[PDB]
Amino acid sequence: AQTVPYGIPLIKADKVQAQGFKGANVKVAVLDTGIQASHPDLNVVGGASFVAGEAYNTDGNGHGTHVAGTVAALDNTTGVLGVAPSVSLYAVKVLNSSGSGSYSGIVSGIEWATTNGMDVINMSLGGASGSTAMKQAVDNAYARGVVVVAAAGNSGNSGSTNTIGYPAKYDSVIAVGAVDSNSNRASFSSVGAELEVMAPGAGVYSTYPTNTYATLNGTXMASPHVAGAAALILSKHPNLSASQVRNRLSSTATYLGSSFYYGKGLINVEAAAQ
Ligand code: NA
Ligand code: NA
């Protein structure tokens, strides 16, 4: 009765989970539209909301619940299966139900996660511009040992135009692009010198508000695969620093083409967690 989304075997997360590593006791904060904590296939440990009028454990949009399920949907006999099903999941609401948020709200979410000892921060969000405060927040989180992952953007490519959004563009953040079930680059995936790795992003089935499951497209779907991957590497090698985990993901990636379009390639967690 439990469906395994194609992205799990494509990045070889199933090979690592089989070895017995599932992200147990790794703290992952999902900075998004919140998470439907009551969903039967998700276990939210805690969180915070920096959005006015909405608690952190409700998701009036669906995006956050979907992103969270890709990272951590519970390994059981129902729903879907996450990349790191045993992770301690934290919902940090920085985007409202319409899917938008302020720089200050996001920055607060990053500081909260840094302050509260998160091991991995997933940001399936981005803007055309950044800000000094946002740059300072991600650099600090990274310098403090947190693996920071963000969706590269859904602006495709305009010739040689760099379309990578913020915060993925900052060098302390891993910019994740998207591929489909055939390992081909999705048309919407942003391109640029900053693109770092690729992960499943087209046709991703995951948990969705009001106890159900849905399919969405976006680099937003790709990002959690990498945040989940970092969690598996950390559960297997708890001694690694944020830099080492990051370097393992990019160095062992499967080459797919030019770095402007694919970065270093598709992540291979089995190889990265060696
Ligand atoms: Na499940
Ligand atoms: Na980056």
Coordinates of N, CA and C in Angstrom, one line a residue, residues 25-256:
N25 N 17.5 10.9 13.8 CA 18.1 12.0 14.7 C 18.9 13.1 13.9
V26 N 18.6 13.2 12.6 CA 19.2 14.3 11.9 C 18.0 15.3 11.9
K27 N 18.3 16.6 12.2 CA 17.3 17.6 12.3 C 17.2 18.4 10.9
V28 N 16.0 18.3 10.3 CA 15.8 19.0 9.0 C 14.7 20.0 9.1
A29 N 15.0 21.3 8.8 CA 14.0 22.3 8.8 C 13.6 22.6 7.4
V30 N 12.3 22.6 7.2 CA 11.7 22.9 5.9 C 11.1 24.3 5.9
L31 N 11.8 25.3 5.3 CA 11.4 26.6 5.3 C 10.4 26.8 4.1
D32 N 9.1 26.8 4.4 CA 8.1 26.8 3.4 C 6.8 27.4 3.8
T33 N 5.7 26.9 3.3 CA 4.3 27.4 3.5 C 3.7 26.7 4.8
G34 N 4.6 26.0 5.5 CA 4.1 25.3 6.7 C 4.0 23.8 6.3
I35 N 3.4 22.9 7.2 CA 3.3 21.5 6.9 C 2.0 21.1 7.6
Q36 N 1.2 20.3 6.9 CA -0.1 19.7 7.5 C 0.4 18.6 8.5
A37 N 0.8 19.0 9.7 CA 1.3 18.1 10.7 C 0.4 16.9 11.0
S38 N -0.9 17.1 10.8 CA -1.9 16.0 11.0 C -1.9 14.9 9.9
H39 N -1.2 15.2 8.8 CA -1.2 14.2 7.8 C -0.7 12.8 8.3
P40 N -1.4 11.7 8.0 CA -1.0 10.4 8.6 C 0.4 9.9 8.2
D41 N 1.0 10.4 7.1 CA 2.3 10.0 6.6 C 3.4 10.9 7.0
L42 N 3.2 11.9 7.9 CA 4.3 12.8 8.3 C 4.3 12.9 9.8
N43 N 5.5 13.1 10.3 CA 5.7 13.3 11.7 C 6.5 14.6 11.9
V44 N 5.8 15.7 12.3 CA 6.5 17.0 12.5 C 6.8 17.1 14.0
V45 N 8.1 17.3 14.3 CA 8.6 17.4 15.7 C 8.3 18.8 16.3
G46 N 8.5 19.9 15.5 CA 8.3 21.2 16.0 C 8.5 22.2 14.9
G47 N 8.6 23.5 15.2 CA 8.8 24.5 14.2 C 8.4 25.8 14.7
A48 N 8.2 26.8 13.8 CA 7.9 28.2 14.2 C 7.3 28.8 12.9
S49 N 6.5 29.8 13.2 CA 5.9 30.6 12.1 C 6.2 32.0 12.1
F50 N 6.7 32.6 11.0 CA 7.1 34.0 10.9 C 6.2 34.6 10.0
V51 N 5.0 34.0 9.8 CA 4.0 34.6 8.9 C 2.8 34.9 9.8
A52 N 2.3 36.1 9.6 CA 1.2 36.6 10.4 C -0.2 35.9 10.3
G53 N -0.7 35.5 11.4 CA -2.0 34.8 11.4 C -2.1 33.3 11.1
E54 N -0.9 32.7 10.8 CA -0.9 31.2 10.5 C 0.1 30.5 11.4
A55 N -0.4 29.4 12.0 CA 0.5 28.6 12.9 C 1.5 27.8 12.0
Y56 N 2.5 27.3 12.5 CA 3.5 26.5 11.7 C 3.0 25.1 11.2
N57 N 2.1 24.5 12.0 CA 1.6 23.2 11.7 C 0.4 23.1 10.9
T58 N 0.1 24.1 10.0 CA -1.0 24.1 9.1 C -0.4 24.5 7.8
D59 N -1.0 24.0 6.7 CA -0.5 24.4 5.4 C -1.7 24.7 4.5
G60 N -1.9 26.0 4.3 CA -3.0 26.4 3.5 C -2.8 26.4 2.1
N61 N -1.5 26.1 1.7 CA -1.1 26.1 0.2 C -1.0 24.7 -0.3
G62 N -0.2 23.9 0.3 CA 0.1 22.5 -0.1 C 1.6 22.3 -0.5
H63 N 2.2 23.3 -0.9 CA 3.6 23.3 -1.3 C 4.5 22.8 -0.2
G64 N 4.4 23.3 1.0 CA 5.2 22.9 2.1 C 5.1 21.4 2.5
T65 N 3.8 20.9 2.5 CA 3.5 19.6 2.9 C 4.1 18.6 1.8
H66 N 4.1 19.0 0.6 CA 4.6 18.3 -0.5 C 6.1 18.2 -0.4
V67 N 6.8 19.3 -0.2 CA 8.3 19.3 -0.1 C 8.7 18.5 1.1
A68 N 8.0 18.6 2.3 CA 8.3 17.8 3.4 C 8.1 16.3 3.2
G69 N 7.2 15.9 2.4 CA 7.0 14.5 2.2 C 8.1 13.9 1.4
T70 N 8.7 14.7 0.5 CA 9.8 14.2 -0.3 C 11.0 13.9 0.6
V71 N 11.2 14.8 1.6 CA 12.3 14.6 2.5 C 12.1 13.5 3.5
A72 N 10.9 13.5 4.1 CA 10.6 12.6 5.2 C 9.2 11.8 5.3
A73 N 8.5 11.5 4.2 CA 7.3 10.8 4.4 C 7.7 9.4 5.1
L74 N 6.9 9.1 6.1 CA 7.1 7.9 6.9 C 7.2 6.6 6.2
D75 N 8.1 5.7 6.5 CA 8.3 4.4 5.9 C 7.3 3.5 6.7
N76 N 6.2 3.2 6.0 CA 5.2 2.4 6.6 C 4.4 1.6 5.5
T77 N 3.2 1.4 5.7 CA 2.4 0.7 4.6 C 1.4 1.6 4.0
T78 N 1.6 2.9 3.9 CA 0.7 3.7 3.3 C 1.3 4.9 2.7
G79 N 0.6 5.6 1.9 CA 1.1 6.8 1.2 C 2.4 6.7 0.4
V80 N 3.4 7.5 0.6 CA 4.6 7.5 -0.1 C 5.8 7.2 0.8
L81 N 7.0 7.3 0.3 CA 8.2 7.0 1.1 C 9.2 8.2 0.9
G82 N 9.7 8.8 1.9 CA 10.6 9.9 1.8 C 12.1 9.4 1.6
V83 N 12.9 10.3 1.3 CA 14.4 10.0 1.1 C 15.0 9.6 2.4
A84 N 14.6 10.3 3.5 CA 15.2 10.1 4.8 C 14.0 10.0 5.8
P85 N 13.2 8.9 5.7 CA 12.0 8.7 6.5 C 12.1 8.7 8.1
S86 N 13.3 8.7 8.6 CA 13.5 8.7 10.1 C 14.0 10.1 10.6
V87 N 14.1 11.1 9.8 CA 14.6 12.4 10.2 C 13.6 13.1 11.2
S88 N 14.2 14.0 12.0 CA 13.4 14.8 12.9 C 13.0 16.0 12.1
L89 N 11.7 16.1 11.7 CA 11.2 17.1 10.8 C 10.7 18.4 11.5
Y90 N 11.1 19.5 11.0 CA 10.7 20.8 11.6 C 10.1 21.7 10.6
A91 N 8.9 22.2 10.8 CA 8.2 23.1 9.9 C 8.4 24.5 10.3
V92 N 9.1 25.3 9.4 CA 9.4 26.7 9.7 C 8.6 27.5 8.6
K93 N 7.5 28.0 9.0 CA 6.6 28.8 8.1 C 7.2 30.1 7.8
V94 N 7.6 30.3 6.5 CA 8.2 31.6 6.1 C 7.4 32.1 4.9
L95 N 6.5 31.3 4.3 CA 5.7 31.6 3.2 C 4.2 31.5 3.6
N96 N 3.4 32.5 3.1 CA 2.0 32.4 3.4 C 1.3 31.4 2.6
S97 N 0.0 31.3 2.8 CA -0.9 30.4 2.0 C -0.9 30.6 0.5
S98 N -0.5 31.8 0.1 CA -0.5 32.2 -1.4 C 0.9 31.8 -1.9
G99 N 1.8 31.3 -1.1 CA 3.1 30.9 -1.5 C 4.2 32.0 -1.6
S100 N 3.9 33.1 -1.0 CA 4.9 34.3 -1.0 C 5.3 34.7 0.4
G101 N 6.5 35.2 0.5 CA 7.0 35.7 1.8 C 8.0 36.8 1.7
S102 N 8.2 37.5 2.8 CA 9.1 38.7 2.9 C 10.5 38.2 3.2
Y103 N 11.5 39.0 2.8 CA 12.9 38.7 3.0 C 13.1 38.6 4.5
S104 N 12.6 39.5 5.3 CA 12.7 39.5 6.7 C 12.1 38.2 7.3
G105 N 11.0 37.7 6.8 CA 10.4 36.5 7.3 C 11.3 35.3 7.1
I106 N 11.9 35.2 5.9 CA 12.8 34.2 5.5 C 14.0 34.2 6.3
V107 N 14.6 35.4 6.4 CA 15.9 35.6 7.2 C 15.6 35.1 8.7
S108 N 14.4 35.4 9.2 CA 14.1 35.0 10.6 C 14.0 33.5 10.7
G109 N 13.5 32.9 9.6 CA 13.4 31.4 9.6 C 14.8 30.7 9.5
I110 N 15.7 31.3 8.8 CA 17.1 30.8 8.7 C 17.8 30.9 10.1
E111 N 17.6 32.1 10.7 CA 18.2 32.3 12.0 C 17.7 31.4 13.1
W112 N 16.3 31.2 13.0 CA 15.7 30.3 13.9 C 16.3 28.9 13.8
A113 N 16.4 28.4 12.6 CA 17.0 27.0 12.3 C 18.4 27.0 12.7
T114 N 19.2 28.0 12.5 CA 20.6 28.0 12.9 C 20.7 28.0 14.4
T115 N 19.9 28.8 15.0 CA 19.8 28.9 16.5 C 19.4 27.6 17.2
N116 N 18.4 27.0 16.6 CA 17.8 25.8 17.2 C 18.5 24.5 16.8
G117 N 19.7 24.6 16.3 CA 20.5 23.4 16.0 C 20.1 22.5 14.9
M118 N 19.6 23.0 13.8 CA 19.2 22.2 12.6 C 20.5 21.7 11.9
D119 N 20.4 20.5 11.3 CA 21.6 20.0 10.6 C 21.4 20.4 9.1
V120 N 20.2 20.5 8.6 CA 20.0 20.7 7.2 C 18.8 21.7 7.1
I121 N 18.9 22.7 6.2 CA 17.8 23.6 6.0 C 17.4 23.5 4.5
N122 N 16.2 23.3 4.3 CA 15.7 23.2 2.9 C 14.9 24.4 2.5
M123 N 15.3 25.2 1.5 CA 14.5 26.3 1.0 C 14.0 26.2 -0.4
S124 N 12.8 25.7 -0.6 CA 12.3 25.5 -1.9 C 11.6 26.8 -2.2
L125 N 12.3 27.8 -2.4 CA 11.8 29.2 -2.6 C 12.9 30.0 -3.2
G126 N 12.6 31.1 -3.8 CA 13.6 32.0 -4.4 C 13.0 33.3 -4.9
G127 N 13.9 34.3 -5.1 CA 13.5 35.6 -5.6 C 14.5 36.0 -6.6
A128 N 14.1 37.0 -7.4 CA 15.0 37.6 -8.5 C 16.2 38.2 -7.8
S129 N 16.0 38.8 -6.6 CA 17.0 39.5 -5.9 C 17.3 38.9 -4.6
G130 N 18.4 39.2 -4.0 CA 18.7 38.7 -2.7 C 18.7 39.9 -1.8
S131 N 19.6 39.9 -0.8 CA 19.7 41.0 0.2 C 20.9 40.7 1.1
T132 N 21.5 41.7 1.6 CA 22.7 41.6 2.5 C 22.4 40.7 3.7
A133 N 21.2 41.0 4.2 CA 20.7 40.2 5.4 C 20.5 38.8 5.1
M134 N 20.0 38.4 4.0 CA 19.8 37.0 3.6 C 21.1 36.4 3.3
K135 N 22.1 37.1 2.7 CA 23.4 36.5 2.4 C 24.1 36.3 3.8
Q136 N 24.0 37.2 4.7 CA 24.6 37.1 6.0 C 24.1 35.9 6.7
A137 N 22.7 35.7 6.7 CA 22.1 34.6 7.3 C 22.5 33.2 6.8
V138 N 22.6 33.0 5.5 CA 23.0 31.7 4.9 C 24.5 31.4 5.1
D139 N 25.3 32.5 5.0 CA 26.8 32.3 5.2 C 27.0 31.9 6.7
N140 N 26.3 32.5 7.6 CA 26.4 32.2 9.0 C 26.0 30.7 9.3
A141 N 24.8 30.4 8.7 CA 24.3 29.0 8.9 C 25.3 28.0 8.4
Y142 N 25.9 28.2 7.2 CA 26.9 27.3 6.7 C 28.2 27.3 7.5
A143 N 28.6 28.5 7.9 CA 29.9 28.6 8.7 C 29.7 27.9 10.0
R144 N 28.5 27.8 10.4 CA 28.1 27.1 11.7 C 27.9 25.6 11.5
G145 N 28.1 25.1 10.3 CA 27.9 23.6 10.1 C 26.5 23.1 9.6
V146 N 25.7 24.0 9.2 CA 24.4 23.6 8.6 C 24.5 23.4 7.1
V147 N 23.9 22.3 6.6 CA 23.9 22.1 5.1 C 22.7 22.9 4.6
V148 N 22.9 23.9 3.8 CA 21.9 24.8 3.3 C 21.6 24.4 1.8
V149 N 20.3 24.1 1.5 CA 19.9 23.7 0.2 C 18.8 24.5 -0.3
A150 N 18.8 24.9 -1.6 CA 17.7 25.8 -2.1 C 17.4 25.4 -3.6
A151 N 16.2 25.6 -4.0 CA 15.8 25.3 -5.4 C 16.4 26.4 -6.3
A152 N 17.0 26.0 -7.4 CA 17.6 27.0 -8.3 C 16.7 27.9 -9.0
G153 N 15.5 27.6 -9.2 CA 14.5 28.4 -9.9 C 13.8 27.7 -11.1
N154 N 12.7 28.3 -11.5 CA 12.0 27.7 -12.7 C 11.9 28.6 -13.9
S155 N 13.0 29.3 -14.2 CA 13.1 30.3 -15.2 C 13.7 29.7 -16.6
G156 N 14.0 28.4 -16.6 CA 14.5 27.9 -17.8 C 15.8 28.6 -18.2
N157 N 16.2 28.6 -19.5 CA 17.4 29.2 -19.9 C 17.1 30.2 -21.1
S158 N 17.7 31.4 -21.0 CA 17.5 32.4 -22.1 C 18.9 32.5 -22.8
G159 N 19.2 31.6 -23.7 CA 20.5 31.7 -24.3 C 21.6 31.5 -23.3
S160 N 22.4 32.5 -23.0 CA 23.5 32.4 -22.1 C 23.2 33.1 -20.8
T161 N 21.9 33.5 -20.6 CA 21.4 34.3 -19.5 C 21.3 33.4 -18.2
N162 N 22.0 33.9 -17.2 CA 22.0 33.2 -15.9 C 20.7 33.5 -15.2
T163 N 19.9 32.4 -15.0 CA 18.5 32.6 -14.4 C 18.4 32.0 -13.0
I164 N 19.5 31.7 -12.3 CA 19.6 31.2 -11.0 C 19.1 32.2 -9.9
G165 N 18.1 31.9 -9.1 CA 17.5 32.8 -8.2 C 18.2 32.8 -6.8
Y166 N 17.8 33.7 -5.9 CA 18.3 33.8 -4.5 C 17.4 33.1 -3.6
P167 N 17.9 32.4 -2.6 CA 19.3 32.3 -2.2 C 20.2 31.2 -2.8
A168 N 19.7 30.5 -3.7 CA 20.5 29.4 -4.4 C 21.8 30.0 -5.0
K169 N 21.8 31.2 -5.5 CA 22.9 31.9 -6.1 C 24.1 32.1 -5.2
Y170 N 23.8 32.3 -3.9 CA 24.9 32.5 -2.9 C 25.8 31.3 -2.8
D171 N 27.1 31.4 -2.7 CA 28.0 30.3 -2.7 C 28.0 29.4 -1.4
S172 N 27.3 29.8 -0.4 CA 27.2 29.0 0.8 C 25.9 28.0 0.7
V173 N 25.2 28.2 -0.4 CA 23.9 27.4 -0.6 C 24.1 26.5 -1.8
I174 N 23.6 25.3 -1.7 CA 23.6 24.4 -2.8 C 22.5 24.7 -3.8
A175 N 22.7 25.1 -5.0 CA 21.6 25.4 -6.0 C 21.3 24.1 -6.7
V176 N 20.0 23.7 -6.5 CA 19.6 22.4 -7.1 C 18.7 22.6 -8.3
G177 N 19.0 21.9 -9.4 CA 18.2 22.0 -10.6 C 17.3 20.7 -10.7
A178 N 16.5 20.6 -11.7 CA 15.6 19.5 -11.8 C 15.7 18.6 -13.1
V179 N 15.5 17.3 -12.9 CA 15.5 16.3 -14.0 C 14.2 15.6 -13.9
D180 N 13.8 14.9 -14.9 CA 12.6 14.1 -14.9 C 12.9 12.6 -14.7
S181 N 11.9 11.7 -14.9 CA 12.1 10.3 -14.6 C 13.2 9.6 -15.6
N182 N 13.5 10.3 -16.7 CA 14.4 9.8 -17.7 C 15.8 10.4 -17.5
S183 N 16.0 11.1 -16.4 CA 17.2 11.8 -16.0 C 17.5 12.9 -17.0
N184 N 16.5 13.4 -17.7 CA 16.7 14.5 -18.6 C 16.4 15.8 -17.8
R185 N 17.1 16.9 -18.2 CA 16.9 18.2 -17.6 C 15.4 18.7 -17.9
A186 N 14.7 19.2 -16.9 CA 13.4 19.7 -17.1 C 13.5 21.0 -17.7
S187 N 12.6 21.3 -18.7 CA 12.7 22.6 -19.4 C 12.7 23.9 -18.5
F188 N 11.9 23.8 -17.4 CA 11.7 24.9 -16.5 C 12.9 25.1 -15.6
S189 N 13.8 24.1 -15.5 CA 15.0 24.3 -14.6 C 15.9 25.4 -15.0
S190 N 16.2 26.3 -14.0 CA 17.0 27.5 -14.3 C 18.5 27.0 -14.6
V191 N 19.2 27.9 -15.3 CA 20.6 27.6 -15.6 C 21.5 28.7 -15.2
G192 N 22.8 28.4 -15.1 CA 23.8 29.4 -14.7 C 25.0 28.8 -14.1
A193 N 26.0 29.6 -14.0 CA 27.3 29.2 -13.4 C 27.2 28.6 -12.0
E194 N 26.2 29.1 -11.3 CA 26.0 28.6 -9.9 C 25.3 27.3 -9.7
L195 N 24.6 26.8 -10.8 CA 23.9 25.5 -10.7 C 24.9 24.5 -10.1
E196 N 24.5 23.7 -9.1 CA 25.4 22.8 -8.5 C 25.2 21.3 -8.7
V197 N 23.9 20.9 -8.5 CA 23.5 19.5 -8.7 C 22.1 19.4 -9.2
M198 N 21.7 18.3 -9.7 CA 20.4 18.0 -10.2 C 19.7 16.9 -9.4
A199 N 18.4 17.0 -9.3 CA 17.6 16.0 -8.5 C 16.3 15.8 -9.2
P200 N 15.5 14.8 -8.9 CA 14.2 14.6 -9.5 C 13.3 15.9 -9.2
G201 N 12.7 16.5 -10.3 CA 11.9 17.6 -10.1 C 10.6 17.7 -10.9
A202 N 10.5 16.8 -11.9 CA 9.3 16.8 -12.7 C 8.5 15.5 -12.4
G203 N 7.2 15.7 -12.2 CA 6.3 14.7 -11.9 C 6.5 14.0 -10.6
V204 N 6.8 14.8 -9.5 CA 7.0 14.3 -8.2 C 5.8 14.1 -7.4
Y205 N 5.5 12.9 -7.0 CA 4.3 12.5 -6.2 C 4.8 12.6 -4.7
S206 N 4.0 13.2 -3.8 CA 4.3 13.3 -2.4 C 3.0 13.7 -1.6
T207 N 3.2 13.9 -0.3 CA 2.1 14.2 0.6 C 1.5 15.6 0.2
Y208 N 0.2 15.7 0.4 CA -0.5 17.0 0.0 C -1.6 17.2 1.0
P209 N -1.9 18.5 1.4 CA -3.0 18.8 2.3 C -4.3 18.2 2.2
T210 N -4.7 17.9 3.4 CA -5.9 17.1 3.8 C -5.8 15.7 3.5
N211 N -4.7 15.1 4.1 CA -4.4 13.7 4.1 C -4.4 13.0 2.8
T212 N -3.9 13.7 1.7 CA -3.8 13.0 0.5 C -2.4 13.1 -0.2
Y213 N -2.3 12.8 -1.5 CA -1.1 12.8 -2.2 C -1.3 13.4 -3.6
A214 N -0.3 14.2 -4.0 CA -0.4 14.8 -5.4 C 0.9 14.9 -6.1
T215 N 0.8 15.2 -7.3 CA 2.0 15.3 -8.2 C 2.2 16.8 -8.6
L216 N 3.4 17.3 -8.4 CA 3.8 18.7 -8.7 C 5.1 18.7 -9.5
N217 N 5.4 19.8 -10.2 CA 6.7 20.0 -11.0 C 7.4 21.2 -10.4
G218 N 8.7 21.2 -10.4 CA 9.5 22.3 -10.0 C 10.8 22.0 -9.4
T219 N 11.7 23.0 -9.4 CA 13.0 22.7 -8.7 C 12.7 22.7 -7.2
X220 N 11.5 23.1 -6.8 CA 11.1 23.1 -5.4 C 11.0 21.6 -5.0
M221 N 10.7 20.7 -5.9 CA 10.5 19.3 -5.7 C 11.9 18.6 -5.7
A222 N 12.9 19.2 -6.4 CA 14.2 18.7 -6.5 C 15.0 18.9 -5.3
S223 N 14.9 20.1 -4.8 CA 15.7 20.5 -3.5 C 15.6 19.6 -2.3
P224 N 14.3 19.1 -2.0 CA 14.2 18.2 -0.8 C 14.9 16.9 -1.0
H225 N 15.1 16.4 -2.2 CA 15.8 15.2 -2.5 C 17.2 15.3 -2.0
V226 N 17.8 16.5 -2.3 CA 19.2 16.8 -1.8 C 19.2 17.1 -0.3
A227 N 18.3 17.7 0.2 CA 18.2 17.9 1.7 C 18.1 16.5 2.3
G228 N 17.3 15.7 1.7 CA 17.1 14.3 2.3 C 18.4 13.5 2.2
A229 N 19.1 13.7 1.0 CA 20.4 13.0 0.8 C 21.4 13.4 1.8
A230 N 21.5 14.7 2.1 CA 22.5 15.2 3.1 C 22.2 14.5 4.5
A231 N 20.9 14.3 4.8 CA 20.5 13.7 6.0 C 20.9 12.2 6.1
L232 N 20.8 11.5 5.0 CA 21.3 10.1 5.0 C 22.8 10.0 5.1
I233 N 23.5 10.9 4.5 CA 25.0 10.9 4.6 C 25.4 11.2 6.0
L234 N 24.7 12.1 6.7 CA 24.9 12.5 8.1 C 24.5 11.4 9.0
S235 N 23.5 10.6 8.7 CA 23.2 9.5 9.6 C 24.2 8.4 9.5
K236 N 24.8 8.2 8.3 CA 25.9 7.2 8.1 C 27.2 7.7 8.6
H237 N 27.5 9.0 8.4 CA 28.8 9.6 8.8 C 28.5 10.9 9.6
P238 N 28.1 10.7 10.9 CA 27.8 11.9 11.7 C 29.0 12.8 12.0
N239 N 30.2 12.4 11.7 CA 31.4 13.1 11.9 C 31.7 14.2 10.9
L240 N 31.1 14.1 9.7 CA 31.3 15.1 8.6 C 30.8 16.5 8.9
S241 N 31.5 17.5 8.3 CA 31.2 18.9 8.4 C 30.3 19.2 7.2
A242 N 29.7 20.3 7.2 CA 28.8 20.8 6.1 C 29.5 20.8 4.8
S243 N 30.7 21.2 4.8 CA 31.5 21.3 3.6 C 31.8 19.9 3.0
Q244 N 32.1 19.0 3.9 CA 32.4 17.6 3.4 C 31.2 16.9 2.8
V245 N 30.0 17.1 3.5 CA 28.8 16.5 3.0 C 28.4 17.1 1.6
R246 N 28.6 18.4 1.5 CA 28.3 19.1 0.2 C 29.3 18.6 -0.9
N247 N 30.6 18.6 -0.6 CA 31.5 18.1 -1.5 C 31.3 16.6 -2.0
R248 N 30.8 15.8 -1.1 CA 30.5 14.4 -1.4 C 29.4 14.3 -2.4
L249 N 28.3 15.1 -2.2 CA 27.2 15.2 -3.1 C 27.6 15.6 -4.6
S250 N 28.4 16.7 -4.7 CA 28.8 17.2 -6.0 C 29.8 16.3 -6.7
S251 N 30.8 15.9 -5.9 CA 31.9 15.0 -6.5 C 31.5 13.7 -7.1
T252 N 30.5 13.1 -6.4 CA 30.0 11.8 -6.9 C 28.8 11.8 -7.8
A253 N 28.4 13.0 -8.2 CA 27.2 13.1 -9.1 C 27.4 12.5 -10.4
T254 N 26.4 12.0 -11.1 CA 26.4 11.4 -12.4 C 26.4 12.5 -13.4
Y255 N 27.4 12.6 -14.2 CA 27.6 13.6 -15.3 C 26.4 13.4 -16.3
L256 N 25.8 14.5 -16.7 CA 24.7 14.5 -17.6 C 24.9 15.5 -18.8

